[PDB]
Ligand binder design. Structure first.
Ligand SMILES: *[C@@H]1O[C@H](CO)[C@@H](O)[C@H](O)[C@H]1NC(C)=O
Ligand SMILES: *[C@@H]1O[C@H](CO)[C@@H](O)[C@H](O)[C@H]1NC(C)=O
Ligand SMILES: *[C@@H]1O[C@H](CO)[C@@H](O)[C@H](O)[C@H]1NC(C)=O
Lengths: 144, 496, 147, 496, 144, 496
């Protein structure tokens, strides 16, 4: 189809059925070469359809007009199955008993060093309560 | 007694001499209050909600591109422009176009092309987020008078009362129907690290799928998508959902990167499903610490003649409760309001009343029945109700009872949190610690007894204190401390 | 221009002068839309031209033919000023003292605290002459960087 | 005397006892040689080249694309293929295509499309890397008879001869025209880390721009471009110069990544410009050490009449050379071949010949000249050329010369490198070390003397050894070592 | 050809010569757009041919019919070179040794071997006892 | 004497007192047997075969699809089904389809589609697997009488006899032609790890390619392909050879994955080639142990006139065998049957017969010859045959003979395996160990001797036992143990 804007520049809109057809735009003729067109909706797009003098050959353009000026082509990208998809990267979301567990694990793991420390204090000191207090503190401080 | 089917009940007998008592409540717990001359109550903490939370960042998905425009010019004509490059809500790109002889250009150099696209989020696809506010949270507490007409189902109780609590609130009073007034002086504390959690709501409007997530604030604020503050109308960073292709001579396709709800749910699987109801927003961890004023309240049915008609049969059998007590449902045949005669016996001994009684002075009235509950000392025991009687053996040991109540007292003090300590004055520091210690030891203060009564207990504490002042071996000086601990407990009188 | 191959696959070739024109193949008709064409050369590109039934409209293709089959288009890319240029990043080549060695020595001393203290205390305990200790320590420190 | 115009000339007076002598040749340096009775000789090292360096990798730029083919099929028909997917020198890519209703497919699925392209490099745009080989390098040695008819400029000499030394080369003899034969045994050691560098050449065929570069093998092997070894035909990693567009419906444009000569020049700027001539590739670092056989030479003009006609005039004024010598250019008027009667005097003393003379026996012929050079002792000195005489003074001190000669001797022994020492036999061990040590001390062994002559010098060495055997404190026992060193030096006899 | 089944449903079968052709079925019409036809053999494939109400256009179906119900298409995939190939992965297929293991451990732990041999040789007194203890120690050394 | 040219032969001399002897047969070995007055023998272990092995799994390949059907239904119509989801030998899949308004459906949701295919393998493409059976394996043993008229080459021999042994078999006897009867009470054991190996066969029936392999049970049981038990008709797990394409509206093609014989052979590359003949399946590892009764057997050619005609020539020279024996080929000219007079001499001494003799009483008849075998003592020795005499030297030492015989005895005892120890009775335990030990010591019991006879050896054993009881130092008490060992061996008497 064709329409006139109030700034004096005519506009051409065509559905997905007007690929490679000649359309009469005022005095001259216009051609539509794009093939990724579709029905009309709000998700619209538009551009300056360059005009070429006869004898020149369209290069790298998907629309061209002859013996006309100021022609804008607009069409919609809806009505067909969807598109340069690139999904964005978003990462995957993730007390006394805990301390007792850490010391249990350290004791059952580093048996040689615990035995060495226990025996060194046991042999060096004499009173049992004093030995126990020192060893309890040493085991508590084991995580380094 | 609504708390007869939970897994966390505990008992607090308070003090015979004074009425005020303290409690700790945790989501899903219970605490039953008792006194020597006042009826029992119950307490709950069923919901910790906020209404109308504040909003932080209204994220978006699936940007709806509309009315794109592209323009360009030949080399040596000044870069082109579109009106959409200066308005709000537009993403634009600028680049060069490889123009040549086919196009209308008279040179063979590089030109300029620009494109813009008006960006807005499709409706019903925005992911909003909210942030809590500790000063606004509302904590709910309920109380169920132990009337005793309930078979203990999952249903609501006829007579339940409620009160609301917030950090700002100071005092409250409830009527308990005909039972009387109760005072709940209370303080509250939020769950740990509130400012670290933000809630994400998808507005998907589906009743059979998740619709609210709770996540770390750092991750939510770092998410790469479009976002805006409330009330605004133009999205910031909208370019994260629009991608521009290599420019042809006079066209530049503006692809829509499409919806991303699917990747968001896949990346968010394994996060707790928040609980939401209408305009409220719940939580899953919190304390409520209060003082229960049990002074103005009164007991029911002290005027009934206690019918000796002796017409009773068992509506339910004596069942082993889940918390060291005996449950009992009785049916009457006296056709008038009346008290339920109750006795407890062991070894067939002539003496009676060898059991503590919950649901004090159970009665029969126009409608209802009796849910009478008991706690017998461990060993052989016989329960007597009117003319009928049934045999029963109670599990555990007296030493077990004492250790369990002491362990729960220590655990309760542990739950009171970092607020159990007062630095205002040295006298207050000592008084608070000493009262907290006696609160822990109340259960152990009444383990095993027999004799005359209360006054001799003070004489025993005095004899123990005198013995501790003998200047004997220092390692056995614990006698003075034991005597002092007992003498201080005499001020409460929790056991004669 | 048209040509017939020996396996039945007809071929159509065009120079840069034929964009948006009708070309005859066998009985039916062909349309060329491609606009990046030019004169013929070795940089030749050939591809199938899907045939479409009447009443259909082209979707995403740059040529098509009706009432013909097996038509392959081919054309060159010479005769135009030049193409998605993306220069390959390659690292620039690099153009390639007593105080510097003193710096290496002090750094070595700061990092090898254990062995340095061991050798220093051992020489301090074993040698009982200050002049000999100072000279050997200066030489040991000067040589420390080589190991 | 061409080496009078360099900044590194070094002297070597050889030995009177035997005429064998050693040198060190370093690029740009010189080693002027003198003997007691043989005409002086010079040596250079002007160029170190290799002919036809081997090829290691042939880097391509600007690939020439040819005969691109693309084919595709609808879904439920299986991926397509092209015959170019298995031949040599082809790049291909595979992707799906969004076939639909416009295309002939009846199904709305995803189809398959493949594009293959032939990729061979254009001519005159191959960057080739060449690598040297130590066992074939060629070293140029130049020797200039010291005729003395030269004005001492920038110009080449007439009568000079040359020769080439390669690791395999053993001995060589040069005739030197009328003077006599000289034998040059020589040793060669390449510059440090030759295998670290690769010479890159563009074959650009341009006159005013760089056409070669020298760079590390580690940077070369990692440069991201197509590469092959000589004797190959199918380029490897050719896909680095082709970018494939988005799979369209039944086409896939195969863009040419373009020329990259500009990218390589910019990244390679400032690198030292390698030098090339014909098929020869030079170098800028290396050690050459030759043994000069001065055995067969004879001296010139010892039979001329030695005219006492006493008729000469100066051509150049007595000027201070840059290397411890006095240059003199003189023009004769006797019209016949004749020696130049010359005397050196100090302190106005009647005794004469108190200066060492280079340009042995300066003479005149039918045509030529006299470039007489002198190494005067420091202090007041008067030079006589026939009747003419001029006043001149020399800076520095004899002690300074001893220090300088010793420093240059230790510098030379430092330069000889790891080949200054021989370990096969003990006799060779002492011969080599002892010869090197006496080469170092030779400069000082002929500093200042006065008395009887040469024979007492051995007696002086014996007296020093005897004095060193006085059995006194060990701190002053060095007199024995010094005496031993001097006794070995008596075998040479370079100063009486 | 067209056939009638025992449930009142129609079935159509075609060779490799009916690519994109109209076939009259009962009271209406059917179209075959499949591009992998051929002769009939046991390697047959069949499916329902949905019918579209008049005034519509096909969507994702290689066969469709107008004014007919219950149409089944069946044909064979023979007479042409064969199909999504993907091969199935299948994986490919004493005293002296102990003495050698002992010696290898000894050579890789020379310091600890020197410690154990010197301590046993220094402590034990009888020569035969020194040797027997060494033999047992070596045999036990690498295996634990 | 077939075993003269193998690489693994061994000897056993039996015992003089009793004719019973034991042997071990290993694939590729031989055990020649000798007696004091009976002609020698030999034994073999050539094949370990099984006939008609049982079948375990039968993998298929190149599965043939047929009668494929696909059906679907619109959203909210309930899932669709086909009659083939429950029939034997079928494979099916379920997935959603993208039905819309273009399709006959009334809504715009996702429907259901199901496809089914019958999957029967083509014939002549199945890889069957077989498992051995230890209780049915057949072991082959051969015996060759020492006629000796053979060149000892690679060709077959005439007069050989055979037997077969299986676990169930216990007794057997053979005739050996005119030589006499020999019995084989034997015992057999399977090669190591039979259960770990399964034989894979392709049944392809091709002449220029391998048609069998031997592989581990564990890898074979894990192969990812269709399989069945014998006698079944429906293939389990056929879904491994069929891949389904994406789901369209109402079509889902079922692609055949194609033949996979090539992939199986590549993965099976380097596996040992199995050996098959007729219905026999062979093995390449095994142990057999038998007891050889030599009681009824007798010698040949003792009644001949024993001609002294002295007319003979050497057919071949004395060539050192590969196993410490001498090979000699002789041809006669007497035209008559006759014994071959043979003498062995050392040190050129008049005394004769200083060599052990195999091929007892070598002779001649109307036809035949002589391949006489000699085992001379190490050193210089002379071989006499009739009037001819040759000089030959034998390497090694008598100590070496004893060492090697004991080493092979210990090695054979090691190879007998776990069958050498019976704990049923103490007498049996001791007798079995004692006999095995005496078999080991047999070679050493007849090392070096000379004197009166056999009886004095027993007396020497008693003297050794008495000497061990001299009440001397403990360091020389080994004589008692040696005497006991010698005394038990005296019951055999294999050395004099
Ligand atoms: C749960 O409570 C409801 C309240 O209406 C009641 O109908 C139902 O019987 C209760 N469930 C059970 C298991 O009794
Ligand atoms: C160097 O040599 C040339 C040729 O003899 C001469 O013309 C020129 O003046 C000399 N000097 C320079 C600086 O080129
Ligand atoms: C090897 O022996 C076989 C029979 O065992 C025979 O057929 C073959 O000819 C023999 N080879 C030679 C070289 O005699």
């Amino acid at each position: 189809t064709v329409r006139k804007e109030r700034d004096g520049s005519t506009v051409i809109r065509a559905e997905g059925k007007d690929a490679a057809t000649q359309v009469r735009v005022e005095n001259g003729t216009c051609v539509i070469l794009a093939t990724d067109m579709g029905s009309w909706c709000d998700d619209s797009l538009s551009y300056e359809c360059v005009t070429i003098d006869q004898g020149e050959e369209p290069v790298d353009v998907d629309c061209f007009c002859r013996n006309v000026d100021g022609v804008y082509l607009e069409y919609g990208r809806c009505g067909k199955q969807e598109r340069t998809r690139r999904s964005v990267l978003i990462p995957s979301h993730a007390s006394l008993r805990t301390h007792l567990t850490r010391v249990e694990g350290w004791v059952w793991k580093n048996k040689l060093l615990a035995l060495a420390m226990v025996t060194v204090v046991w042999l060096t000191l004499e009173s049992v309560v004093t030995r126990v207090a020192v060893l309890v503190v040493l085991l508590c401080l084991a995580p380094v | 007694s609504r708390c007869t089917h939970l897994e966390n009940r505990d008992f607090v007998t308070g003090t015979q001499g004074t009425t005020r008592v303290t409690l700790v409540l945790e989501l899903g717990g219970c605490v039953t209050i008792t006194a020597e001359g006042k009826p029992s109550m119950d307490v709950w903490l069923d919901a910790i909600y906020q209404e109308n939370p504040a909003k932080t960042r209204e994220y978006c998905l699936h940007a709806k591109l509309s009315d794109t425009k592209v323009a360009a010019r030949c080399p040596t004509m000044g870069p082109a422009t579109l009106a959409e490059e200066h308005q709000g809500g537009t993403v634009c790109k600028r680049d060069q176009s490889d123009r040549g002889w086919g196009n209308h250009c008279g040179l063979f150099g590089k030109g300029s092309i620009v494109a813009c696209v008006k960006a807005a989020c499709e409706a019903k696809k925005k992911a909003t987020g909210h942030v809590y506010d500790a000063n606004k949270i509302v904590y709910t507490v309920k109380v169920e008078p132990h009337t005793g007409d309930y078979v203990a189902a999952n249903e609501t109780h006829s007579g339940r009362k409620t009160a609301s609590f917030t950090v700002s609130s100071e005092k409250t009073i409830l009527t308990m129907g005909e039972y009387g007034d109760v005072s709940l002086l209370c303080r509250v504390a939020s769950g740990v690290d509130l400012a670290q959690t933000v809630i994400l709501e998808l507005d998907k409007t589906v009743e059979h799928l998740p619709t609210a997530w709770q996540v770390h604030r750092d991750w939510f604020n770092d998410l790469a998508l479009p976002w805006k503050h409330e009330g605004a109308q133009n999205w910031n960073n909208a370019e994260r959902l629009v991608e521009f292709g290599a420019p042809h001579a006079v066209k530049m396709d503006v692809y829509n990167l499409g919806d991303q709800t699917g990747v968001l749910l896949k990346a968010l699987a394994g996060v707790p499903v928040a609980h939401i109801e209408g305009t409220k927003y719940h939580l899953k961890s919190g304390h409520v610490t209060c003082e229960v004023g049990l002074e103005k309240l009164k007991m029911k049915g002290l005027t009934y003649t206690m019918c000796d008609k002796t017409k009773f049969t068992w509506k339910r059998a004596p069942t082993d409760s889940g918390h060291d007590t005996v449950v009992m449902e009785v049916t009457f045949s006296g056709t008038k309001p009346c008290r339920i005669p109750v006795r407890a016996v062991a070894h067939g001994s002539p003496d009676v009343n060898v059991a503590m009684l919950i649901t004090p002075n159970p009665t029969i009235e126009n409608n209802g029945g009796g849910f009478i509950e008991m706690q017998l000392p461990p060993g052989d025991n016989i329960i007597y109700v009117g003319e009928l009687s049934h045999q029963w053996f109670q599990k555990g040991s007296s030493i077990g009872r004492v250790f369990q109540k002491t362990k729960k007292g220590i655990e309760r003090l542990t739950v009171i949190g970092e607020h159990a300590w007062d630095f205002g004055s040295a006298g207050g520091f000592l008084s608070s610690i000493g009262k907290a210690v006696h609160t822990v030891l109340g259960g152990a203060f009444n383990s095993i007894f027999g004799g005359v009564g209360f006054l001799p207990k003070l004489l025993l504490g005095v004899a123990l204190a005198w013995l501790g002042l003998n200047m004997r071996n220092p390692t056995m000086s614990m006698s003075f401390l034991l005597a002092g601990g007992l003498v201080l407990a005499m001020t409460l009188g929790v056991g004669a």
